[PDB]
Amino acid sequence: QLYCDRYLCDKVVPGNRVTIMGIYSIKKFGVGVGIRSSYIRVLGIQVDTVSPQEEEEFRRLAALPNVYEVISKSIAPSIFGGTDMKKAIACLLFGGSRKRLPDGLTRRGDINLLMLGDPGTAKSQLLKFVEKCSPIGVYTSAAGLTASVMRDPSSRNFIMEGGAMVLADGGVVCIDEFDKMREDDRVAIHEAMEQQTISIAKAGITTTLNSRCSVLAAAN
Amino acid sequence: DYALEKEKVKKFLQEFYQDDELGKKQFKYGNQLVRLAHREQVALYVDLDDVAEDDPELVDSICENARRYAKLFADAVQELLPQYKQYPAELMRRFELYFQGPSSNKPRVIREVRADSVGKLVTVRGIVTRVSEVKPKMVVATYTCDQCGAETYQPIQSPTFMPLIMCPSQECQTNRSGGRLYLQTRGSRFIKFQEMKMQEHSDQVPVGNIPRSITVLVEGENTRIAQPGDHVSVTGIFLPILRGLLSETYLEAHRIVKMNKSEDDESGAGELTREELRQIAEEDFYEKLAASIAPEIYGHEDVKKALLLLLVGGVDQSPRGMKIRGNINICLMGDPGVAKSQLLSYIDRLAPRSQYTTGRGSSGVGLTAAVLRDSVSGELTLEGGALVLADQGVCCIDEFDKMAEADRTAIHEVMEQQTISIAKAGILTTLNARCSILAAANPAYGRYNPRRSLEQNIQLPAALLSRFDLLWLIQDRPDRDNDLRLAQHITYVHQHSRQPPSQFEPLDMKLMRRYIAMCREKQPMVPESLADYITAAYVEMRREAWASKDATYTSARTLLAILRLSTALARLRMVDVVEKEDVNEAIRLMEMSKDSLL
Amino acid sequence: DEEAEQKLFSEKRVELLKELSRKPDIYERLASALAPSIYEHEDIKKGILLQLFGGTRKDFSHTGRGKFRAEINILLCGDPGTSKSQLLQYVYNLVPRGQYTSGKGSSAVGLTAYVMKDPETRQLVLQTGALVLSDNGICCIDEFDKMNESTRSVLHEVMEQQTLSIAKAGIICQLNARTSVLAAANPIESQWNPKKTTIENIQLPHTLLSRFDLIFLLLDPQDEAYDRRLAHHLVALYYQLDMAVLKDYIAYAHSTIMPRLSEEASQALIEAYVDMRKIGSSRGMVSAYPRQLESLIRLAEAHAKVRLSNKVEAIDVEEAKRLHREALK
Amino acid sequence: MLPRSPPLPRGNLWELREAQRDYLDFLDDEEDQGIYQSKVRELISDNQYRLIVNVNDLRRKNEKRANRLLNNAFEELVAFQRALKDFVASIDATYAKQYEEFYVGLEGSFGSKHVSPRTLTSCFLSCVVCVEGIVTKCSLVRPKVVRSVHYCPATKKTIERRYSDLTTLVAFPSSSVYPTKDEENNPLETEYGLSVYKDHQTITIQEMPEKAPAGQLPRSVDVILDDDLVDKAKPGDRVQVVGTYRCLPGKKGGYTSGTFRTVLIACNVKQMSKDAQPSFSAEDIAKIKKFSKTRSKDIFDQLAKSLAPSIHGHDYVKKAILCLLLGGVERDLENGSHIRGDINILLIGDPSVAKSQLLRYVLCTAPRAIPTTGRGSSGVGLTAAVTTDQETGERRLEAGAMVLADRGVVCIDEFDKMSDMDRTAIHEVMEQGRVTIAKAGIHARLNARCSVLAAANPVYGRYDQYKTPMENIGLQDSLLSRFDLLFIMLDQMDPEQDREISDHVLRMHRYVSAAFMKKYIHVAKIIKPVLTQESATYIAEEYSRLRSQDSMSSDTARTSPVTARTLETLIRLATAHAKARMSKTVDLQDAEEAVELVQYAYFKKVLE
Ligand SMILES: [Zn+2]
């Protein structure tokens, strides 16, 4: 357990790699008779990992005559055959544009894809690739995909669990075995791709979560 | 200051006139003080409209404080009592004083009473819940020093109190510097006490908000007035609880009035006048009421004739120790849109004790009685269902074909023996549930069809079909003429918001609810000379339903219909013996209930 | 609790009982005094009267056999309106230490024994159901058909061995009781259609029909004479033998009687079982297993107790054989 | 987008003596334009405690004080509220004593103080801030003493006592001992009627979802409403609290942990979203009374054409949806009966016929509309469910969807993916208008007078145009009677309509008045026309001709049964058509406008 201070607060996010320099010490708020608690008072922190000239290697590449295939060729090195199934995936990484008519009746800005066919493990590779090479992306087979309402042991009441499609903001979500997902969960993912938001009205929960992600599904 | 108020209240208590006593100007409180002095009465409901008749200022400063004043009054009467006819002046009180709300104030709701009215006289309306049982609350604890042979007292105010171990008499201490004194439950004084919660009417709540509760400390004479699950109106101070700066509050009831009838409990005021005996003595009194039941509904001249027998009910015997029920059960199988859920909603409001339930929104343990645990004590307690809360009244269950099949056999017990026998793992008992049931249902798949016979476009097991004395069967026959008159009725209704002028104007609900309560307690008999007529009729039935291809399951439980469906009629005509003219009315009913199929 | 109190009978009363027990029909004179509101139904009252005495309480601890049930289980099947539930409602109000149960409002563990988290000590403790609270008396189970086959297969133990073996989380024990079921059911389709076979209107298995020993089929149609007599009787209840004879005759006949078989009675009990097999085999009505041969004993002895005969003779087998035969017809 | 003012700045047109003597001079306000002397009086005529101030004015008047007030809020707001009682006594001293103490809210534009609960650091301690966000709980309103009044029955005197806690602007912890014997000689007795209590709540603002960085669990903050600000916020809102920020310490056993808890002592609240339209101009009402008079022939059709221009075809459905948006007239007879005054519409058809579009438009047009689906909705979660509390542990009745939307609209899409055990929970709340619940420890009846707009995909995936209208719909003839209008919008296969539909949507993908229907229907809703015997004999005839099968046709099937329940839907559509005209008397031209709709919606034709 750590203890950050004035300017070290809000410097790291759950999921980071760090390197702490702290003063290993003991709590003094005064199993065993003389046992104490212990923490590390942090007083140094680190994190482990755009340009004008970099802009030009995007410019010229967008301008070169055969700009289309150069990407769709280098987005699936291992798996080969039928570049259409790789042609399409090139678009999902960019997507259309979000329009707001005068009525505020916004429009989608993402796409969805289904790769039907036998599970022959040729598609899991592709899922892993598209997840790895994405600005935001999650590959799922826990809490679920959409939100749930679960009876908390402590509260003894129902609480709300936003799943994956609420954490992926603009990103891309990959799914396999489209008949394995929980019946309720499959209903909710249907509605989420329909409306692009999840709104549960149950025991003590009436909230809304904007789902803004891209579905790349693989069937069987 | 108050020393001059104790005189301005004595004046009012000794001087007040009243004319409505039916005599001359007597003294409303003049007689009361004598009765109280002769220990023939305990409570003195000092009205506040009468102080607001000659001094509208004192009323302003009562409902402003109402805590000092309720003590000045109990001192004024304490002084006046001897003048008509132990050590502390409270152990010898033996009476209490209560304020009956002033008429100018308006009955608030539970949500409205805020902190700006702590310590003032308020008035709330609500539904009772979780009324406790009477327990003795101490007022003046009496101790004794067994050593020095004395008697001592101390008065209690808080919900707690610390006893005494002194014997503070300086003589006992001075002589010997030693001695303890025992508590004692003889010389002390207790007073009845019970606490009960109130909730808002779920009607007068914002569209989806949670109702709030309040606590009421009934004590003294107002106890045992209110029953749980009840509409009530309470008048009492609104105080905080003793023992940081936040405070929890309770209502300290001074007056409790039942408002079941939507106006004020007038069941005890069910007095029929001679000018109404005029009507009740007419030739066809039975036929006026029948037409004055839910007049907004055209047609159905016969169904309204049976829904009245259900409200009056037959007589119940007990020969050689073999109980026979004296209630009537009725079902209303029929096509969609024939105003069944209107008839039921009306028969709900025309009954002293009634309940409304829907088949698809009620579970089988929630109808009869449920055993539920308290996570505060871990103790299992019983909790009545619908049929228990509707003990001496009527229960209404529409959408009766859609109730789950394991939640419907929990009615077979209440329809014949009229008890509920629970043997779950906390309790083992039989509650009394003497209710008469009235249910509505759709025949097969929404609509009757003439291909399949009965019993297959009804879908009730014979064991339950036979529990119903009258399974009435209506239809949506689209006869061009029958539709024209129905429409010319409903459009008149939507124009004027009333029914078209009928032969006889319907009686008020308030008046029928009394005409019937007077008509229940007759208990007519049966004459022997009729046992040959009745018999033959019954026999004939067992022939037809045995020599037919549609008829239902008739059994020896049908005879008791004819019998108990005629002691109802003979109870309307105010006779004290069943006559051969009512047996034929009953027999006609049991025939006009399945003719809608021929 | 009043077995010591039976010695507290006026000797003026034992004369009365012993003398009433000599009239040639004291059987039909006591039986016909049960429930003086049902119509004739002459046999069902005979069965329900023999159930209030029960066979002897023999002591089989020596033969290592175990124990031996001495009470009689009775089943009533028949089409609606035939006054079954009234007989249960009457018995339940007569016998002390009894219960009344129903079909859907009773579970598997609520009838025999459940395990509850005791609130204070937070520990699992055992409790007793309905078939164990009766324990000396009758456990009326109405609506016998409408209990899913799970909760119906529980009666197999408590109604034949008079025991109950529990093995749950921390409780491993073996109760016992001396109850006697009295059940009432409806035929399947709730209508006794005579096209099907008797073992098809009941629709109960054989491993459950054999634990009963008096299956009364109330086959009653629209007999124009019966209906007329019944209606004439029922209407009479609207105008307007003793008990303490029966209430004391029963205590006596329990306290100081123990019918032991004979050799002339035992020689009519062997053939009465060798014919039952050939009869019940073909018809397809209800087969007969050796358990019935014990029931006859149970019935025969129970008849001898009615007349205080203290010894089972021939006629006490012919009666309780005609009763066992003329109930399924 | 940054909210740098409570009044949306884009389209607003359409010692301690110096402070106290400067606030008074600011509150004079007479000599320049009399802005506040027009507000003090205004509130005295309404009997209010507090008045809202614009700091934007304090700036122009005196910059130094405007800065010293946003950085030392406590010592400045204890001097503002003093020199406000001073200035109200300078108008009506009789009023200036009715109330114990006055209060003063704030509003305007604070420079860097407009923060979110995520940015509210510990450099804003004792500084006016303006927090925005969602309320996600409330507390139980409880009194709280600020003064006692005691009494000596022996000495006939009267002593008082002033209370103060850590939730004041002065912050001295007083003990609530309630003295019973000041001097050991005399006994005391409290007088509750003459004491002074106040209200007290505690809500929890939480950061807006679409403003979170989405990686964490958005931050929260605790607000302490008071003194008739109390019930001004329910769970699920979007508020802009404007209150001082404060840390309140503690000590359990003479040894304090340095850790403190920080709260926000609110002194104003603002609902950000405008969810009402009663603000109309006299020019607007003039326009309205013009338009309602111009042509009585064609105002309904002209209204409905302009309903949803973003959709091509479906004129009938738009007509009926307008009828929904108006509503009938709820008659309650004298004996206590009640007849509903709403219209429930059902739309079935092949995929992609703009059903969801019509629903999503009816949502935004009408006020108080609630959306719902066919799988994210249980039979009990629609009406009311029993639960308990976490603080008290005693049961209560949480309101479902169709009880929140009272006097409103409920939009149920994919009404067919709802199990049979779930539709049945509606038959009471769609006709009788109120929900009845008898659960274990709950017996209640909630008012749910609403109207249902539902959309359902047909069985077989697509509407087989040959079977029959009854086999393409799974609903049983008991639920099919509740919904009084059934529109079969099967995918328009005719080649013409698709052409203009494509034109329209593609034009949209290359980027009567709209904001006038709002006011016009919000006005024409209240009118309550009354039948007349000229038409009431025409309806009473068209129904008796509908009810006769022969007069219908051959080779024509029935979508839904005609009962005595469609009769009073004729009456409802009629008096909802004479609500657009603002007519107040239905005529024979109405009872004929609403009969063709029925003739079209009830009977379908089968092919082979
Ligand atoms: Zn003493």
Description:
Chain A: ADP binds at residue 107. Chain A: The modification Phosphoserine is found at residue 51. Chain A: Belongs to the MCM family. Chain A: The modification N6-acetyllysine is found at residues 128, 132. Chain A: It is found in: Nucleus; Chromosome. The structure is cut from a larger assembly and holds chains A (220 residues), B (598 residues), C (329 residues) and D (608 residues). In chain A, 24% of the residues lie in helices and 25% in strands. Chain A has 220 residues and is an alpha/beta fold. Chain A is extended. The two termini of chain A are 46 Å apart. Chain B is an alpha/beta fold. Chain B is built from 20 helices and 21 strands. In chain B, helix 19 (566-572) packs across helix 20 (580-589). The longest helix of chain B is centred in the C-terminal third of the chain and has 17 residues, at 480-496. Chain C is α/β, with parallel strands linked by helices and 329 residues long. In chain C, strands 2-5-8-1-9 form a five-stranded parallel β-sheet. Chain C has a two-stranded antiparallel ribbon with strand order 3-4. In chain C, helix 15 (290-304) crosses helix 16 (315-325). The longest helix of chain C has 15 residues, at 290-304. Chain C starts with 10 loop residues before the first helix and ends with a helix. By secondary structure, chain D is of the alpha/beta class. Chain D contains 18 helices and 22 strands. In chain D, the strands form eight sheets. Chain D has a five-stranded parallel β-sheet with strand order 13-16-19-12-20. Chain D has a four-stranded antiparallel β-sheet with strand order 8-7-3-9, with no helix packed on it. In chain D, helix 1 crosses helix 5 (73-80) and helix 1 (16-28) crosses helix 6. Chain D starts with 15 loop residues before the first helix and ends with a strand. Chains in contact: A-D, B-C, B-D. At the B-D interface, strand 11, helix 10, strand 14 and helix 15 of B face strand 15, strand 17, strand 18, helix 16 and helix 17 of D. The site of zinc ion (ZN) has 8 residues of chain B, from loops.
In short:
Chain A contains 5 helices and 11 strands. With 220 residues, chain A is α/β, with parallel strands linked by helices.
